[PDB]
Amino acid sequence: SVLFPCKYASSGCEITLPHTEKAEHEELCEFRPYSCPCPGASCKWQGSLDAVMPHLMHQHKSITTLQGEDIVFLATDINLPGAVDWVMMQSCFGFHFMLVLEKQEKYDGHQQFFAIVQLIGTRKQAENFAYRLELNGHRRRLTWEATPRSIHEGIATAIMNSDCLVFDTSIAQLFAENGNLGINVTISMC
Amino acid sequence: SVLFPCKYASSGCEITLPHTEKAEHEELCEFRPYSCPCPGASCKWQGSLDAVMPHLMHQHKSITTLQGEDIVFLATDINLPGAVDWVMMQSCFGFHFMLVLEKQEKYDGHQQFFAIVQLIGTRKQAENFAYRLELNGHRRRLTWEATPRSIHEGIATAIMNSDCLVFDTSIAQLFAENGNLGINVTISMC
Ligand SMILES: [Zn+2]
Ligand SMILES: [Zn+2]
Ligand SMILES: [Zn+2]
Ligand SMILES: [Zn+2]
Ligand SMILES: [Zn+2]
Ligand SMILES: [Zn+2]
């Protein structure tokens, strides 16, 4: 009956729990310092939820932004050497959703593409939405529907487990035109 | 004049025309002998369009036949070290559509899956349909929609170019249950 751990009370975590449920509570605690949602270990920034957007606008380059729950993101030069990440912020339902398209080079001889959507918010908040990604081509269509992850959790684990849209260089050429790739992104509430 | 003969003219094409252009007509000839539409290169059977189905029933008992334009194919034992092909025949709209799921590692160590549907008929008849493949899971869906290939063309090219549904062991892990994988297959007339 002794409540004591939780290393986040300082950040406003007015909660006290037993030592048996410490390790688990912390990983998914609400008051755990959010990391920079941008792909890449380049930005070491850390801070609170409400500090995220400001961090992205002021201390990061100009990211493309689109209004609406149904839009089309154009990832240009998907073949360009050096290209590895495409980021776009989607504003709808009073929230901001980050779309990330990552191109990873694999040792076994191929280049994979990972597209996923992250909500600039909490896990319980993310659970209320659903996103759909579409690659539309001539008489062809590749679609991925799933629940957006919260930036708290990150995109890394999901990408590691292929829990997102996964395609590759060859699939990307099938849908691309003039070296550019259009990705339909649709977000909806449950 | 001196008209170049079609090698398949014996079957039923009195359409004898010069080499130059018309020689390319053979590739799209309505009377070319059809090879066995089964995955791989093992079976050397040859024959007319009207003989394909009886051949599959006679030589390939491992085919799972099903009725309807909206079915669910259950590919059992996807993780097994010996699984490589899963074939299912779908009968609808007066035709037969062959679903093939191939497990192959183009890249070393990386097991990938290729799912595609081919019509037992001419490519022109194929042009009149469209198919949809779905991997349905808990709060997630992977869908592929495209035009079915004609058995005359084959599968080899689509798979090499990734013009079909492409996933791997990891992605399968998100959908499979009890070692089995359910694939929704819907066929519709254009
Ligand atoms: Zn806490
Ligand atoms: Zn940052
Ligand atoms: Zn086009
Ligand atoms: Zn001919
Ligand atoms: Zn055969
Ligand atoms: Zn690989």
What is the DSSP secondary-structure string of A21-56? GHHHHHHT-TTS-EE--SSSTT---EE-HHHHHHHH
Closest C-alpha to A88, from A78, A72, A77, A99? A99
The H or E element containing residue B3 is none
Q: What is the rounded CA–CA span in Å between residue B100 and residue B89?
A: 9
Closest C-alpha to B184, from B149, B151, B154, B141? B141
Question: What are residue A54's phi and psi, to 5 degrees?
Answer: -55, -40
Q: Which CATH number fits domain B57-190: 2.60.210.10, 2.60.260.20, 3.20.20.480, 3.40.50.2300?
A: 2.60.210.10
Q: Which ligand is nearest to the CA of B7?
A: 4
The answer to whether B140 faces chain A, any CB pair under 8 Å, is yes
Answer whether A143 sits within 8 Å of B144, measured CB to CB: yes
Which of B147, B161, B174 comes nearest A163 by C-beta? Answer: B174
Taking a contact as any Cβ pair under 8 Å apart, which residues of chain A between 68 and 127 contact chain B?
106, 108-110
Closest C-alpha to B110, from A165, A163, A164, A112? A112
**Chain B residues touching A139 at Cβ < 8 A:** 130, 146-147
Strands B181-189 and B129-137: antiparallel
Q: What is the rounded CA–CA span in Å between residue B128 and residue A146?
A: 31
Q: Which CATH architecture has domain A1-56?
A: 2-Layer Sandwich (3.30)
Report residue A109 as tokens.
């001889």
Way it was determined: X-ray
Domains B1-56 and B57-190 share a fold: no
- Ordered by start, the domain boundaries in chain B are 1-56, 57-190
The answer to whether A138 faces chain B, any CB pair under 8 Å, is no
Q: Tell me the C-alpha to C-alpha distance, in Å, between residue B132 and each of A38, A170, B70, B117.
A: 34, 20, 9, 9
Check if the beta carbon of residue B125 is closer than 8 Å to that of residue B95: yes
Answer whether B146 sits within 8 Å of A140, measured CB to CB: yes
Chain A: closest CA distance from residue B183 (Å): 15
Answer whether A174 sits within 8 Å of B163, measured CB to CB: yes
Chain A: closest CA distance from residue B180 (Å): 18
